[PDB]
């Protein structure tokens, strides 16, 4: 049993709810909150953006000093930062930006990240601002997570369309 609450089901492990993820944090401070990242961690716009801005800017400083030391990540990668006030960790992953070119193939090793977590709250990853298909998201996190993750999807319209077409 979680904090978590008004999430329809969608699988034994899948869960998704219309809802602000950083909103949902504060309220419960999950152990491990996923950042839509890119690989130089510059959190600029987005989930990033918003969840950047909720920490006061917290996450950038961390985020420079992380970048400073060890480079970008690569797409499809992840690394594991503080949660600041939102969480105890923040697992910043990067899928692939569609309106960089990215191969979307990528979308599915950017998935696989979630499963060193036993619970983590997510958005789709490559959706929004990165200009995958969210319905494909939604399957690959299906067919690609197998520990239990709690979406949080910012636009009502787009979470409608997500739940009443979900095969
Ligand atoms: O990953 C892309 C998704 N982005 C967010 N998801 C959840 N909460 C959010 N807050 C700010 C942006 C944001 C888009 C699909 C509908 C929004
Ligand atoms: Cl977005």
Do not use: W
């Not at 970008?72 to 992953?93: E, F």
């Not at 696989?112 to 319905?135: K, R, T, W, Y």
Request: one cysteine or more; charged letters at 20%; proline letters at 3%.
């Amino acid at each position: 049993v979680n904090s978590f609450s008004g999430y329809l089901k969608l699988t034994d492990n899948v869960y998704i709810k219309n809802a602000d993820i950083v909103e949902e944090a504060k309220k419960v401070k999950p152990t491990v909150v996923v950042n839509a990242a890119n690989v130089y961690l510059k959190h600029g716009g987005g989930v990033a953006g918003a969840l950047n801005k909720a920490t006061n800017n917290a996450m950038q400083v961390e985020s420079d000093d992380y970048i400073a030391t060890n480079g970008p990540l690569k797409v499809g990668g992840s690394c594991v930062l503080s949660g600041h006030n939102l969480a105890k960790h923040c697992l910043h992953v990067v899928g692939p930006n569609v309106n960089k070119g990215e191969d979307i193939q990528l979308l599915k090793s950017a998935y696989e990240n979630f499963n060193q977590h036993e619970v983590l709250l997510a958005p789709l990853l490559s959706a929004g601002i990165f200009g995958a298909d969210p319905i494909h998201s939604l399957r690959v996190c299906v067919d690609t997570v197998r520990t239990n993750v709690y979406l949080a999807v910012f636009d009502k319209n787009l979470y409608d369309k997500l739940v009443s077409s979900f095969l």
